[PDB]
Design an enzyme around this catalytic site. Structure first.
Site, short mmCIF file in Angstrom:
data_model
loop_
_atom_site.label_atom_id
_atom_site.label_comp_id
_atom_site.label_asym_id
_atom_site.label_seq_id
_atom_site.Cartn_x
_atom_site.Cartn_y
_atom_site.Cartn_z
N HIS A 16 0.83 -1.19 -0.20
CA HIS A 16 0.15 0.08 0.02
C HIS A 16 0.78 1.23 -0.11
O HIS A 16 0.37 2.28 -0.21
CB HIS A 16 -0.86 -0.13 1.10
N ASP A 50 -2.09 -10.80 -1.65
CA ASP A 50 -2.74 -10.42 -0.70
C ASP A 50 -4.25 -10.10 -1.03
O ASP A 50 -4.37 -9.70 -2.14
CB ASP A 50 -1.90 -9.03 -0.35
N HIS A 81 -6.07 -7.65 -0.41
CA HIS A 81 -6.17 -6.30 -0.76
C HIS A 81 -5.26 -5.86 -2.11
O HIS A 81 -4.33 -6.48 -2.23
CB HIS A 81 -5.77 -5.64 0.33
N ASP A 124 -3.97 -13.01 3.57
CA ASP A 124 -5.14 -12.44 4.52
C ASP A 124 -6.38 -12.96 3.68
O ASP A 124 -7.30 -12.58 3.79
CB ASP A 124 -5.10 -10.95 4.55
N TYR A 155 -3.40 -12.26 9.04
CA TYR A 155 -3.55 -11.79 10.41
C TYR A 155 -3.90 -12.80 11.22
O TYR A 155 -4.01 -12.67 12.37
CB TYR A 155 -4.41 -10.61 10.35
#
Ligand SMILES: O=C(NO)C1=CCCCC1
Ligand SMILES: [Cl-]
Ligand SMILES: [Cl-]
Ligand SMILES: [K+]
Ligand SMILES: [K+]
Ligand SMILES: [Zn+2]
Length: 356
Positions: free
Chosen positions: A132, A170, A172, A263, A303
């Site tokens: 990010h 990931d 995201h 994740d 996580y």
């Protein structure tokens, strides 16, 4: 030979106001422990961590951004809480800068070991994550864009146009990675991500399938966005079969970097998806058919400590040459996943004849 980099110093980055924040120090120690426990660690060649230099950070980041994060090392909590709250989803401690430097430098040493033939592939158990982070700002638990920096570092020690594929699995979207390379045809960015019509973090339509790159980079940004479904191994295997692998083969990368967040894993408290450890193993095994096997797996998010530890360990087992574990019977794709894949196919068949 498979390289492995892990350094406990990267645990020192921490959230001093919420010690239970999910981007935990123990994410990396747990993954490392699982490698020990499965007897994978002794099968790998240990690669040392090092600090990235400021000159290396400048390969992707602005001087202002580097300066601000650097300054945080000597800030009192008041400066730190306030500064972190200026970004979207960031906490900062006095060790954060150093840890972000070690994450990047670890990956540079790993890419160097691959590109010089010391190891055939490698795994980097690093935090804080990177994907990010933008040229000019931190975001989403990420300070510097480790994967993007590693691609440019790789180019700097080989040739400027070295073909680097970044596969970001990931859950995201890696907004920072997309933006850094959006106008670049030497770094192919392929992201799979939960999208939900722009509702899922990082909450931007930049993650949609119609963002194919800009300028010289048109065709070199591939977004595979998921909507309206608890996606898992069937959808990820189908995306690899129809999109990731045909495009990647046609690009013919000389180095593959995986922005390997875990994740999207079954059990993750945020992602809502159900990719299994054996699913990640299969994805890894497919990527090993590219770039003469030159693959570096870089931890991003993820996580659930158990899920990430099992999942990343299965990836390393694949890098070591173990045979893929068996997938469960793959259910018919969720209807929206077929729609997503077909949308990407239509967006990218102009640029990639293998999709036609
Ligand atoms: O895992 C991530 N990015 O990859 C997250 C960023 C901030 C919101 C929560 C999770
Ligand atoms: Cl989220
Ligand atoms: Cl041109
Ligand atoms: K992604
Ligand atoms: K690109
Ligand atoms: Zn993530």
């Amino acid at each position: 030979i498979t390289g492995l980099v892990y350094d406990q110093r990267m645990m020192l980055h921490h959230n001093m106001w919420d010690s239970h924040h999910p981007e935990l120090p123990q994410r990396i120690s747990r993954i490392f422990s699982r490698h020990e426990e499965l007897r994978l660690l002794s099968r790998c060649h240990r690669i040392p961590a090092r600090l990235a230099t400021e000159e290396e950070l400048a390969l992707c980041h602005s001087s202002k951004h580097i300066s601000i994060i650097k300054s945080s090392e000597h800030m009192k909590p008041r400066d730190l809480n306030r500064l972190g709250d200026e970004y979207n989803s960031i906490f900062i401690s006095n060790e954060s800068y150093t840890c972000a430097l070690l994450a990047a430098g670890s990956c540079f040493n790993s890419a160097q070991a691959i590109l010089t033939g010391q190891v055939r592939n490698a795994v980097a158990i690093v935090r804080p994550p990177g994907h990010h982070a933008e040229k000019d700002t931190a975001c989403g638990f990420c300070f510097f864009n480790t994967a993007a920096l590693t691609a440019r570092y790789a180019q700097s020690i080989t040739r400027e146009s070295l073909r680097v594929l970044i596969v970001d699995w990931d859950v995201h979207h890696g907004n920072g990675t997309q933006h850094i390379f959006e106008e670049d045809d030497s770094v192919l960015y392929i992201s799979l991500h939960r999208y939900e019509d722009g509702a899922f973090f990082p909450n931007s339509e930049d993650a949609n399938y119609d963002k194919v790159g800009l300028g010289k980079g048109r065709g070199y940004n591939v977004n595979i966005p998921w909507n309206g479904g608890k996606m898992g191994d069937p959808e990820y295997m189908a995306a690899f079969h129809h999109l990731v692998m045909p495009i990647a083969r046609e690009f013919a990368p000389e180095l593959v970097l995986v922005s390997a967040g875990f994740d999207a894993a079954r059990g993750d408290p945020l992602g809502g998806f159900q990719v299994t450890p054996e699913g990640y193993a299969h994805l890894t095994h497919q990527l090993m058919s590219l770039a003469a096997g030159r693959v570096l797996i870089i931890l991003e998010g993820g996580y659930n400590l158990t899920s990430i530890s099992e999942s990343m360990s299965m990836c390393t087992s694949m890098l070591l040459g173990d045979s893929p574990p068996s997938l469960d019977h793959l259910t018919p794709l969720k209807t929206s996943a077929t729609v997503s894949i077909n949308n990407v196919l239509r967006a990218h068949a102009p640029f990639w004849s293998s999709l036609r």
